[PDB]
Symmetry: D2
Subunit: 252 residues, 4 copies
Amino acid sequence: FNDIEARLAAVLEEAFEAGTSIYNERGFKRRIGYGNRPAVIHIDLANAWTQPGHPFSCPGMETIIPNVQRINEAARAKGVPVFYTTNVYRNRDASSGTNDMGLWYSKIPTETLPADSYWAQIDDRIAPADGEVVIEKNRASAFPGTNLELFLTSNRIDTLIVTGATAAGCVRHTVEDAIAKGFRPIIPRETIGDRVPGVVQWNLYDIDNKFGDVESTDSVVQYLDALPQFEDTVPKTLSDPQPEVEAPADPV
Amino acid sequence: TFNDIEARLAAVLEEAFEAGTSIYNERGFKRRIGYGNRPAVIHIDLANAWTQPGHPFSCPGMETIIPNVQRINEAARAKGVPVFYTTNVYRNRDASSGTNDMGLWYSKIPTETLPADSYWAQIDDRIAPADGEVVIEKNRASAFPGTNLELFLTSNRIDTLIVTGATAAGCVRHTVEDAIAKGFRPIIPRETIGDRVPGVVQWNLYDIDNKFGDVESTDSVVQYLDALPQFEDTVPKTLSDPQPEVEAPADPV
Amino acid sequence: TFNDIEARLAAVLEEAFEAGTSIYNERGFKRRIGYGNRPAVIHIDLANAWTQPGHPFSCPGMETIIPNVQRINEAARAKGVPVFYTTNVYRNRDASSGTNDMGLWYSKIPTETLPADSYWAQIDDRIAPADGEVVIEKNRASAFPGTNLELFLTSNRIDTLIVTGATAAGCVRHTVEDAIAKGFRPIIPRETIGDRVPGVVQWNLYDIDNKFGDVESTDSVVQYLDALPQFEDTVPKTLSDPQPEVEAPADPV
Amino acid sequence: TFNDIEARLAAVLEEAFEAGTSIYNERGFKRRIGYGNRPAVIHIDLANAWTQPGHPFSCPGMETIIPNVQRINEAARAKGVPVFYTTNVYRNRDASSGTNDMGLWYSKIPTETLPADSYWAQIDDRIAPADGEVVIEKNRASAFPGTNLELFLTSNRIDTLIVTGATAAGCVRHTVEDAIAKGFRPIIPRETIGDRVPGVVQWNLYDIDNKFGDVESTDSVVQYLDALPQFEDTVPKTLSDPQPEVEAPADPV
């Protein structure tokens, strides 16, 4: 419900159809596929995003969190690694040489996200279980400045299930980084949120076209339900075979 | 795409951008990063596979992108500004091989069609690199993963990165997100950005301007470059530009 | 008993050092990187597991190290210079776990003896972090992998990294060479470097000075920081200092 | 150097190593990382500047190193193992240019003597790359900064990296410690490691075996590769091998 959103949703679907035909003819929008040794990462489902009243609050939590709980419940039944990020700063004074906001402060209100405040805590409804990692990050993607890639590479993870907020911010930069670094991104659609119109729709479409597969939470839970116990999983060593299109030859 | 779809899409997207801009501004997003004092220009994939027709990566609109890229190059070269070019090409395109360089991007887009050293891999002749400009062969969307770009930028104290090229919903956006994260101010000259399906340039330049960099006109970029001292004399801005600060909400208990 | 091994090894290592230095000088290695203009100080792992006796990682010589480290801190905080501290600690020491953060360094050194938030993990009281100084919990030898150190150094345009701490044969060397590679001039104050077995401090400092940073006295570093402007007014040297250049050997064909 | 020093040096260094190993042993260091199941080989700078006499980077001992590198290569090529080669060369060697790729390493070693595409940049003929093998041009000591090596190793799930090459006191050590940090088990065939001044090979291989990788004989490495399944069929070891765990000390208060 909203004045614009019904029309925006309807016309964005038409634009999406059009684009999918061009993409499909050219051989884009291929399926990356689920791998065998997954990790789950919840991007910034901390109070500043899940609770109302912060500059970073996202609506839709009433639908995101139950779906996040279904995934957590499936994953921790197999001992799958679960990571959470909270985007917070220890030194919010942009004139100091030890400030950790860098240039993102020149774009978004980083000074409103103090480390170890209520706003920095992962939301109670999905509190971290024992052995799950909470990573405090300083930039949008969960990779820069954190140790997420040291866990994922050292422990041979091949699939990264990404959930969280926002589609137009931290989720997309994380997914883009993951496929480039070497991890298969699966995005469970109902767990992604944002705070302005259209951005969830068009960012998930862009992600599904070139960076990760956007799936239903039901698909993701069913996949985790069919997993062996994590300690017995082995990664897929190369990409899944694709219907290859042929490289055009030099015109001269 | 039928013109009724194009027409109605521009209209609803404008409604969405108006609405979104108000929310962002109210909350303190969409601030201006601003030009720094010691820039580099990088042209993302304005190589024949994107600029010429007949390849699966071909982007339309080059007729508008190329003369504007040239305006930037002319202003930059005049000042001795570093200009980098990238081309997204692969030395070993067999997904079954242990030294294939396509990795998992082959499971999403047709990377097998981009051979290194072919016609398609060369930079477009209309904007041919000048002596001393760097051409980087890259394997992933952003210009940073697996390349030496960040070594140039950090070791030579570059504070601003003018990003041009293709595509808005692919390589240009991931390069901009990486650059601001790493510490370089991204300025996107709006007219030098291309793509190949409806809506994507508009909504991706909207998202970039809101959280990752300042979308500007090529006119503004050229005026900035024209006002620079010679690159030899530029020194970088050492911290962020001061911002209108939003106050952190106090904890309810 | 008594075996004069320390003095015997120092005398013959000095003979090796004279020989190597002649070769390096002739070939044009061992050049001075020189101090830049906008410095940061990083103290590597001077936490209780290294500075206090009783832990598998304890280093002797802290009585010489800590006062020199304190001299640099006192000189740095007088100028508003950024000071960073690392502590190498782990939050999940169960190598069977998928969320263990020790990776493969557990197959070489006893990582499971370093718990985060224990006494052992705490920076030594004699050099307690002052307000605004950063404590980085790291998981690998160099202070860069898996941390946000590079984000501070690149975003705040730092050009010089003064490195102190433990050990010459572990964490200090890998940090120093990662620093010059990424673009930060490493200066090592000799007297603040420690280790726990013979020879390693000497030969690792020699190797660093030859190809990766300048090994100086703490006196020179304190004097550099004392002659510095306030940090807010410093700006980085934009390129390398000119070197006496050696000519490339001509190709046979 | 003086041969009397070479022999004195070898003998006294053995005393220092013996003593050091006793201490590492009483602390639980120097554990074995072990061979994994899915390896790649990397030859660090066995290019003409290092292998052939007459360059400032020339190394002695190639008559021993190269037959041993050839044995590894023959074994690897039989199983289809990925073999990578690096060469350390520069496209723009003018330190005052904003697009020079030498960075600050030029302020330490003579990087201006290493042109890309020169005779000196070529991989030595005796160990010439076979088709499918990758030659990586790199700009800094470790083979990881500014290159796509990590893209190959992570995307293709390599767990072990066999490192050969020049020098022990430079590019080989930085590459090995980067590798264990990133998540790849480093194996060093002792006979294939070279350098140009006294003692460095000995003390750098000691330091590496203590904390960063396993120094093995070439026979050991060849036996491993000969026992391997065909590369296409190998799967990586997903976590560390179990280690003899040392007791984490309790906090004194």
